[PDB]
Amino acid sequence: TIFEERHLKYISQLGKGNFGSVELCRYDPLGDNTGALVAVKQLQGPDQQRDFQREIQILKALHSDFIVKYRGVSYQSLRLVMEYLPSGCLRDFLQRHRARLDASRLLLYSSQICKGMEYLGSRRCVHRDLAARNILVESEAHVKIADFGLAKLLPLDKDYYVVRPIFWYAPESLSDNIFSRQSDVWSFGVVLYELFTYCDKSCSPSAEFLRMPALSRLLELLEEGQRLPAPPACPAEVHELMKLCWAPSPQDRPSFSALGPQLDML
Numbered sequence: 265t266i267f268e269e270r271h272l273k274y275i276s277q278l279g280k281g282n283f284g285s286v287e288l289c290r291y292d293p294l295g296d297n298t299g300a301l302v303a304v305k306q307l308q309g310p311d312q313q314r315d316f317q318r319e320i321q322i323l324k325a326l327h328s329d330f331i332v333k334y335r336g337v338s339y340q341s342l343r344l345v346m347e348y349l350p351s352g353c354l355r356d357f358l359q360r361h362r363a364r365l366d367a368s369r370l371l372l373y374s375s376q377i378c379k380g381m382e383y384l385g386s387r388r389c390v391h392r393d394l395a396a397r398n399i400l401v402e403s404e405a406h407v408k409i410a411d412f413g414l415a416k417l418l419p420l421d422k423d424y425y426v427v428r429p430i431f432w433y434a435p436e437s438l439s440d441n442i443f444s445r446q447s448d449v450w451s452f453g454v455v456l457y458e459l460f461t462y463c464d465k466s467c468s469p470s471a472e473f474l475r476m477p478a479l480s481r482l483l484e485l486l487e488e489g490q491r492l493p494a495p496p497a498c499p500a501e502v503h504e505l506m507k508l509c510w511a512p513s514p515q516d517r518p519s520f521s522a523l524g525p526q527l528d529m530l
């Protein structure tokens with residue numbers, strides 16, 4: 265739970281979240297290079313130092329097969345140590361191994377994410393940035409949700425939270441900065457789209473919405489009932505779930521708990 269700085273061997277850069285920098289390291293106390301690989305997040309202002317301390321505590325308290333595992337912290341500077349998922353980001357994974365991933369396997373990922381999200385909801389936690397770029401691949405048969413830097417905990421007497429990339433945002437989030445489990449559902453509809461386009465750049469959410477002020481443009485387009493199209497070779501039933509995920513009103517969207525069985529039984 266407390267990883268010593270001098271034993272964390274820097275290997276390379278894994279990327280930047282919404283927030284800071286993530287680095288691949290080997291925690292190698294014995295010195296043999298036999299140590300376990302770990303992902304280490306850190307910052308390099310007070311406002312994000314505050315949100316970082318929350319993110320550490322959120323990930324620490326969450327326990328699920330489909331959420332990146334917290335492992336500890338490293339100290340006069342605070343770093344977050346997490347398990348390393350060596351197959352990397354789902355976005356890149358899908359583009360690389362498209363040829364060997366049929367619809368059944370995409371549904372498996374959808375279901376695993378749905379179960380991860382169902383768990384978050386029960387911990388009254390709103391991810392706020394659910395997207396393929398923030399999903400990680402544990403193995404070819406297993407994915408996990410990551411990056412809780414923008415994550416908010418619903419007040420204990422409220423089902424929404426108002427707050428201070430737009431193509432994953434629900435309408436009420438764009439217009440009124442309102443976020444909730446239901447705004448997470450909207451975004452889940454977009455990852456379904458990403459899964460079944462194999463995160464192809466040329467037909468990404470941005471490329472489609474751009475083809476269809478930018479924030480006000482998107483919002484007017486959504487209010488008109490226009491949506492991302494059915495991905496090619498996406499089963500019709502899955503497309504219908506996306507459409508339900510993108511219901512105009514938050515209350516008309518299905519819960520993650522209702523989606524799960526619908527995804528599993530196709």
Ligand SMILES: N#Cc1ccc2ncc(-c3ncc4c(n3)n(C3CCOCC3)c(=O)n4CCO)n2c1
Binds near residue numbers: 279348356398
């Ligand atoms: N947090 C975390 C976190 C926790 C464990 C973990 N094990 C592996 C990764 C990882 N491996 C490779 C990544 C990658 N993450 N990310 C970003 C994902 C969103 O968070 C910020 C980094 C990338 O852009 N790549 C490039 C190639 O896919 N990983 C990230």
